[PDB]
Write a protein that binds this ligand. Sequence first.
Ligand SMILES: CC(C)CCC[C@@H](C)[C@H]1CC[C@H]2[C@@H]3CC=C4C[C@@H](OC(=O)CCC(=O)O)CC[C@]4(C)[C@H]3CC[C@]12C
Ligand SMILES: CC(C)CCC[C@@H](C)[C@H]1CC[C@H]2[C@@H]3CC=C4C[C@@H](OC(=O)CCC(=O)O)CC[C@]4(C)[C@H]3CC[C@]12C
Ligand SMILES: CC(C)CCC[C@@H](C)[C@H]1CC[C@H]2[C@@H]3CC=C4C[C@@H](OC(=O)CCC(=O)O)CC[C@]4(C)[C@H]3CC[C@]12C
Ligand SMILES: [Ca+2]
Ligand SMILES: [Ca+2]
Ligand SMILES: [Zn+2]
Ligand SMILES: [Zn+2]
Lengths: 671, 43, 671, 166
Amino acid sequence: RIPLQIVRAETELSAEEKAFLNAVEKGDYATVKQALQEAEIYYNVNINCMDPLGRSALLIAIENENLEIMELLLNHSVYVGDALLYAIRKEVVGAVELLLSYQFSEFTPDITPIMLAAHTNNYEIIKLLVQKRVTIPRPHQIRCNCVECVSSSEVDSLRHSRSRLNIYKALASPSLIALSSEDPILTAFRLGWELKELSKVENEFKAEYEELSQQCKLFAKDLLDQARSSRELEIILNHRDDLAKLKVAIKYHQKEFVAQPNCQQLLATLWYDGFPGWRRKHWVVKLLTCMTIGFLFPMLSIAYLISPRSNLGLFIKKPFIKFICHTASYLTFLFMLLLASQDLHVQGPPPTVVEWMILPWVLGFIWGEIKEMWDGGFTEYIHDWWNLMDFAMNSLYLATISLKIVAYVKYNGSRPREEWEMWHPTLIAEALFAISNILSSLRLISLFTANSHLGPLQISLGRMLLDILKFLFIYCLVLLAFANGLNQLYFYYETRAIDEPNNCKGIRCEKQNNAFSTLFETLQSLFWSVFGLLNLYVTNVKARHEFTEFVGATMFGTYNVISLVVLLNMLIAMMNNSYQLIADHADIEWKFARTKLWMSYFDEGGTLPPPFNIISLIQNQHYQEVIRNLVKRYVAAMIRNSKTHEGLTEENFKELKQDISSFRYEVLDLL
Amino acid sequence: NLVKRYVAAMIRNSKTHEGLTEENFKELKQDISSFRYEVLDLL
Amino acid sequence: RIPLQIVRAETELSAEEKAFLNAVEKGDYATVKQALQEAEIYYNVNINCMDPLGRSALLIAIENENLEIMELLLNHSVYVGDALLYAIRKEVVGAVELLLSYQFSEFTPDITPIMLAAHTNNYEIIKLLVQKRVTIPRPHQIRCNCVECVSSSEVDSLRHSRSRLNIYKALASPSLIALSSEDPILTAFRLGWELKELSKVENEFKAEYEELSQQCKLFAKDLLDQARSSRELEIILNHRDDLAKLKVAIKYHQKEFVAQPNCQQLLATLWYDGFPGWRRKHWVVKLLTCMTIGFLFPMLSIAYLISPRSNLGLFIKKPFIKFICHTASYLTFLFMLLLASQDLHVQGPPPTVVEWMILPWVLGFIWGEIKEMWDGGFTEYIHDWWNLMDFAMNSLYLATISLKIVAYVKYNGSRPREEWEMWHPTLIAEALFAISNILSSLRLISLFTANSHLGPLQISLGRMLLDILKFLFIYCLVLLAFANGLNQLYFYYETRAIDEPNNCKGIRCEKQNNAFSTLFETLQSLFWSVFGLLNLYVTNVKARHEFTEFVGATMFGTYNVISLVVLLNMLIAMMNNSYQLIADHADIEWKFARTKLWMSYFDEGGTLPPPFNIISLIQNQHYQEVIRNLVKRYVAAMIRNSKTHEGLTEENFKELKQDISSFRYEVLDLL
Amino acid sequence: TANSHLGPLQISLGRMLLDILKFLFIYCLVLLAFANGLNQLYFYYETRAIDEPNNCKGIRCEKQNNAFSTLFETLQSLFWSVFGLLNLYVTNVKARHEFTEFVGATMFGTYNVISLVVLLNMLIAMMNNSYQLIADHADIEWKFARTKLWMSYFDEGGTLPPPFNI
Ligand SMILES: CC(C)CCC[C@@H](C)[C@H]1CC[C@H]2[C@@H]3CC=C4C[C@@H](OC(=O)CCC(=O)O)CC[C@]4(C)[C@H]3CC[C@]12C
Ligand SMILES: CC(C)CCC[C@@H](C)[C@H]1CC[C@H]2[C@@H]3CC=C4C[C@@H](OC(=O)CCC(=O)O)CC[C@]4(C)[C@H]3CC[C@]12C
Ligand SMILES: CC(C)CCC[C@@H](C)[C@H]1CC[C@H]2[C@@H]3CC=C4C[C@@H](OC(=O)CCC(=O)O)CC[C@]4(C)[C@H]3CC[C@]12C
Ligand SMILES: [Ca+2]
Ligand SMILES: [Ca+2]
Ligand SMILES: [Zn+2]
Ligand SMILES: [Zn+2]
């Protein structure tokens, strides 16, 4: 048998005292008042005493919203401490007003009434608390190293982190940003960015800072949603302290704000500037118009170069026409690169007619990249992540040009390629040119963003490449390990190239040999084993060492089982799990990326596609009025949605029970 | 006949789904309080 | 502008008449009674009139559960029709009792009060209706062809199907089976089986019959769940009209009833008859005991053959020991089959020592199969779906024996196999023996059911083989189509075997040839193209018909794209979707299959593993008492669970509003 | 385990290796069965190593031979058939026993269909189902494993890395 007792004993209540608390619970005003006036005389019943479940009489009256017993206890001067916070968390405006008019606690000591109101996100109570001059202390920097922060971290790191988290949850309140903020949209933007940075820094408290940042982004989105006219939309988007607030939203990565339908509609009607009725057109006439503009890019470009002030000169300044001209010029560049592959023994030859055409687009690409560098700056250049491969293309083109010039100057004769040197400058130049050709032709992935049916697909690829990168570390570790083992076994039986039937050594021969003789060749062989191009007899030696053969063969088999059966199917399962997490927000992310692509063409800089590129208090007052109407509409909408969602608990049933019982004792008293 | 049956069916299904919010609790609270001030007035 | 009107106009109510219905809605008894006694005199207000929303005064009183206005209207003799059914659907026992004591309708004409009560599944109302002698008409056979059924199908097939569905939904009520049934468990079993058959037949009304069958199975499971002692469990399982009801449940495929924890515990303690403490033992001692019993199967078998009445004779009659002995004998048979592969030029040789051992297990397997046939019967034999491959094994073994005997009798000499005939009886016999070896060795999949970690895996394979079978039709259609096309192109360039370098024709040669010359070889080639074993140069001819080559190559490429890229990934996606639908019920299905495997060993027949197999109203009364206690417990449990689930709608809020308003007009009247 | 972005990935591998181990029993049973059948058919036509063009016997030669002559070599051949490194003409004999050839070839085809088409896609579906059950608690399991790794270094014993500990 197990004895049961109370190992942590407390102070029990007496019979009359339990009767008093029970009368408070059922709401008998006559009995409670009689007990109070009897206690004032006899000092028998403690009015500030506790209950078995953690509450006192004022707490019971507050949770049961019985304002009349609550004010009776206030008039009898019961203990008051933390009951204000209890009324704040209870969301009872009458209790809040009465306690403003005048041990164990389930609240942290930092909990201030404004902060608990900001947690409860109740606009009424937050505004009544803000009516009095009440202050929230400022959080320090994200990476602050001052003496106060290091002392608070050293003394009690749990209370420091809880205090910072408590401050930021107070500040991220949608009601507390709707009031007491000169610019709620910009405040929500900066607060969301800061909460994202604190989510990145504080690893353990990551999810709560993530959800606070998401709450701020949702608040900004709904505030934009409450607009009701195109002027108000453009006052919001064009406020600066054009499209300044939109550029700020793009800078702070507010994809929910950017992907608003009204903002996307305004961006679309700015994008289709020259064509007012592109929204309602057929597929065939859209394709015909696109090809018609795309076949006239040199005419429009030379029109801009000659006279910007004409029906054709400023026609390319429209964003869609500029995008079509850039795409058409780049596609003609790729067509010429395809034509370039269509005497070959000259050492360091002069450039042909096709390369003589290619050279100005190469110079224009380099000039455009360095012009974007010099104009935008550094962080904006490195943030794009396409400029890395753009730099790779420019570097490979420059290397090809330099090697071609070096070969043309240094060599003159016509020697057949069969006896050329292996590190010949012409060979190096042509290899670099082919690599740059591939990089140029995969640069077209960036144009899938502007299409409706390919943009989310590109977003899904960009989100699953991260998991491919995660898997590549494990696969390369396994590859290095098995390459090391197979080298350590097989590098005694290395054979010269002369002993081979056709003077070829390596896995690229007709008869594959020496697949595990050197570390480079072992890495190549175990890489090509994934696609099945490495035959089985590469695990063979001329000597009769059958045990050596069997250990090498089972090493190869273990590598194949780990890679193709385990790791590849692991990669399939990982990307399949990752795709479902992206399919929900793919539309929003695609709309954000397409907005960035659209705003990339709104500038006057970079207008000419290559190779042609080498040849004020009223605004504040109107914005304040629009935001004031927006805040009123948003508070009304979130009040309506609070009165439309579920919201109901057993609090409501015990509230109705309390009202019925208080009335019951009232009419039993009056009758 | 189909429209009469459909209106009856969707009324029944409106009276069979969840449909309830804190509007209903404050409605009952309002009825109880209005009655309360009524009988405090009559008595 | 669109005009709006009432295209289907109805009869509006007058002002006093709307006032009367509004007074009924708010529950003013004084106003309603005054209006009734005024209408009795003046004939100005129609008491049976309709409202804008389809109801009358009695309907409003019934839906608002206001029994006092409802009985007032009953005393004033308002229209009564279908208000009883309205009270049945409303689940108000007072309204039901009062209407029992005494146009447009949203109910079908077949709706009878007992049937609507059975739909509502309210035990109280169903019992009050059953107190009066009330009858439900019998549904006919599933495939009945009588004149009444064919006439009802021809006259109005919608009303016939709705009537049958209405009858079966009435009969499948858990409360209506808990009452008025001599055997609720057997009634639920037969009703679930019949509803499954009607689900199979009625294709359009499939889901509702499926959910009714599932409801009956759940009712039977919960009725078994309400047992509270091992005697009651065994009275339920051992009732017959041993384990007769359990065998009936297995026959009717009640997997939920079979997979009950108490039933599985009783089956386990019958299964581990000889070992009382196998439940609490270590893995190593379990493995040691299993190998110890498995290495002694001939000793236990010969002990049973010599003397069944001993410590060793009846030791094999225990189910676990019998299962271990069968498994050990069959594993030794497979070990001998492995040994059989370890002079070869004799035409029709005598059987060797290993085959002379194999022959009695072959005879024992055939004898056991025909004995199971003769004992169990026909439907039980063909239902197992393992007996098909068992028959295949027996037929191949018999064919091997017959061909070996024919070869031994007909041939005597010793000719080397290089010049044997291609259809030689020895060659045919050895091919059939190898095929039977594979079938014998994959017969071990059936033993994965008895294991804890492999049984659900076998269930998942058995459920995804259906989708593989579904996909195989499409793949074989594509295979036949592309084989036909490639034959029609390539069968002009068929070359003889002599013209080949090594006198070999077909895709099984060193140099693959003639892959699309005949239909059989084209089917083989396009089958082997799936696994990559068919090289690319099989699409080549000796002549210089390059267009012919290109069309053949692009046909091969289109087939590879359809098969490996589209169809194989389709199969992967289909099985991945199918696995998630099986992972939920895999435990229940595995427990059912393991119960079937356990009951297969409970019989005295088939005790000896091969080759050794060729060498009473008190029961009804106790069952009735146990079922009566079970029904009382189940009704109490489902009443408690009805008072524990959500169950609440705006019906409850308008009920409380009606009570408050009726009281309000009452006290305004009394004061 | 000590890394933020690789620890849950290692946990996911450690949880899907159990399902790979579950599948390996069925695959090895099928492998043993088809190896037994192909041995029982093909072990009459075993050829010596001397008769071969380059005195090599087995599936590791230039010309693959005797893939189903012994049980060890049949197990090796039907293992290497999974990755496609076993050519089709290993189901060939010098004699003109075309029925023997056809039965051996359809045995090889049935094994390939069971393994690559059915069983491998079964393994893919099984690990894909198993990964979703682990993705929810991967963070908690990784934090537990990293806590164990951290507490492994809190002791004074085992302070010196090798070879300084001797
Ligand atoms: C991939 C195969 C078909 C070979 C053809 C290669 C290129 C000639 C293709 C591949 C990608 C194509 C691009 C994919 C998407 C677009 C966006 C498309 O714009 C829209 O979606 C129209 C609506 C809008 O811009 O608002 C204009 C054509 C363009 C650049 C396409 C131009 C032609 C490209 C470069
Ligand atoms: C697949 C590899 C490892 C080669 C070995 C082949 C056979 C020797 C194996 C494969 C399947 C095995 C069977 C799988 C499952 C079981 C059930 C097992 O019983 C239990 O799970 C114990 C608990 C109980 O029976 O209640 C007894 C052994 C047995 C028949 C195994 C016996 C050994 C078998 C036949
Ligand atoms: C796989 C490719 C890139 C070849 C390189 C092989 C090794 C040189 C790599 C592969 C795995 C790497 C390890 C992966 C993870 C870590 C944890 C990392 O520690 C952290 O994550 C820092 C934070 C912390 O420890 O709290 C320290 C480096 C280390 C041991 C890495 C060291 C370098 C390793 C051994
Ligand atoms: Ca750029
Ligand atoms: Ca059987
Ligand atoms: Zn600081
Ligand atoms: Zn009938």
